[PDB]
């Protein structure tokens, strides 16, 4: 009963941003010490709780969001943020209770002529309320004729790539992003510390 | 038929306050990125704002705390709040629909702002 | 944090010669990069994005290559009313945006 935290953060394959991968975390014990001094995560903030105090907590359930982002957009996984993670991929409430996760995948998620298997969401109407997902493919409608599902003038395809090339400045590379939520409700705690 | 009519601009005293309109048609405003763009005489392009269509605004530090971008969906309109003017403020100001990836495809036709005594 | 620069930084060229003007940026933008064309008292306009791809209606003389920090834009055959200063852009999708500083293009006749 160790929390399968390997599964998360050691996954082979990542979520693109919009399509944000979700996993509970039910039933064992977590040793986040070991996380959080990894320096291998170049991002280890916590909200609402302390970090070097984690081990010491018990949770309803843990949720592990994950997904891939450049870089420059880590700092929009936090609550309060702007920009077109926060407004239309990823959004975290105001009132967070958890820590998110960070570090540079260059190697694994760029790809020598580009890779473009991650997206994200560039056209959308308004901002997603928060841990919402949208997987919406229909086309964005930009002036008022319809379109139809047909591309075009005012018509376009609402999730565009990130084109990955290893040559990319530090700020334009993929960064893997584990989002940790800490629930606690009115019943029995199942997620505890040593 | 895509065209952005602008307003507003003219003379204005160091200090002063001036607001610059942008009427479009062929596209509705509130649903896409737009953004003010400036061309000091002589001189090279300078962004200056970005609104999103869901809300969110975004500045030049040079325009930081002294701008503000908005619009008004009835009257398909895009603005900017221009306050505490200075010398340095004098340019023409475009606005331009934004398709982020792919370009600034139309602008409107410039409106020059002079801050002078 | 990006720098665009462009060169050269003006350039005279006769009717039906081939024209490069190159941007080159601070560091590796991948694709994301915009080619302008301004004629004097108009306002940009747009002639390529995506480093290549040809805006709608714009002529096939005009195209666009490059990626990561080394750019360049193209007329095959150039014509008179070619003349302008051309800007390039890095087309963000966070913002700052920025420009190049401008190449000013002169016919030689």
């Known amino acids: 009963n160790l929390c399968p935290f390997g599964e998360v953060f050691n996954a082979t394959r990542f979520a693109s941003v919009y399509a944000w991968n979700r996993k509970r975390i039910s039933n064992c014990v977590a040793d986040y010490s070991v996380l959080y001094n990894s320096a291998s995560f170049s991002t280890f903030k916590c909200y609402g709780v302390s970090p070097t105090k984690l081990n010491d907590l018990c949770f309803t359930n843990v949720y592990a969001d994950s997904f891939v982002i450049r870089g420059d957009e880590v700092r929009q996984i936090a609550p309060g943020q702007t920009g077109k993670i926060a407004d239309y991929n990823y959004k975290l409430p105001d009132d967070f209770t958890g820590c998110v996760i960070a570090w540079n995948s260059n190697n694994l998620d760029s790809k020598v002529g580009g890779n473009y298997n991650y997206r994200y969401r560039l056209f959308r109407k308004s901002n997603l309320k928060p841990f919402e997902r949208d997987i919406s493919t229909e086309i964005y409608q930009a002036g008022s004729k319809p379109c139809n599902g047909v591309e075009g003038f005012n018509c376009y395809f609402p999730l565009q790539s990130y084109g990955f090339q290893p040559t990319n400045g530090v700020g334009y590379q993929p960064y893997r992003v584990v989002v940790l939520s800490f629930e606690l409700l009115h019943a029995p705690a199942t997620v505890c510390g040593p | 038929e895509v065209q952005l009519v602008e307003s507003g601009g003219g003379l204005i005293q160091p200090g002063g306050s001036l607001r610059l309109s942008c009427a479009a048609s062929?596209?509705?405003?509130?649903?896409?990125?737009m953004n003010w763009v400036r061309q000091a005489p002589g001189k090279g392009l300078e962004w200056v704002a970005l609104?999103?269509?869901?809300?969110?605004?975004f500045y030049a530090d040079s325009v930081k705390g002294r701008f503000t971008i908005s619009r008004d969906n009835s009257k398909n309109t895009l603005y900017l709040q221009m306050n505490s003017l200075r010398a340095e403020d004098t340019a023409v100001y475009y606005c331009?629909?934004?398709?982020?990836?792919?370009?600034?495809?139309?602008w409107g036709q410039g409106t020059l702002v002079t801050v002078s005594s | 944090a990006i720098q665009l620069t462009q060169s050269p930084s003006s350039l005279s060229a006769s009717v039906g010669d081939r024209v490069t003007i190159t941007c080159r940026a601070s560091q590796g933008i991948s694709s994301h990069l915009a080619w302008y064309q301004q004629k004097p008292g108009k306002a940009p306009k747009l002639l390529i994005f995506a480093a290549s791809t040809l805006q709608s209606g714009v002529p096939s003389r005009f195209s666009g290559s490059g990626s990561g920090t080394d750019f360049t834009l193209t007329i095959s055959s150039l014509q008179p009313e070619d003349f302008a200063t051309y800007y390039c852009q890095h087309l963000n999708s966070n913002p700052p945006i920025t420009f190049g500083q401008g190449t000013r293009l002169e016919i030689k006749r």
């Open positions: 609104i999103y269509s869901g809300g969110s605004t």
């Open positions: 331009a629909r934004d398709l982020v990836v792919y370009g600034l495809d139309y």
């Open positions: 062929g596209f509705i405003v509130s649903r896409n990125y």
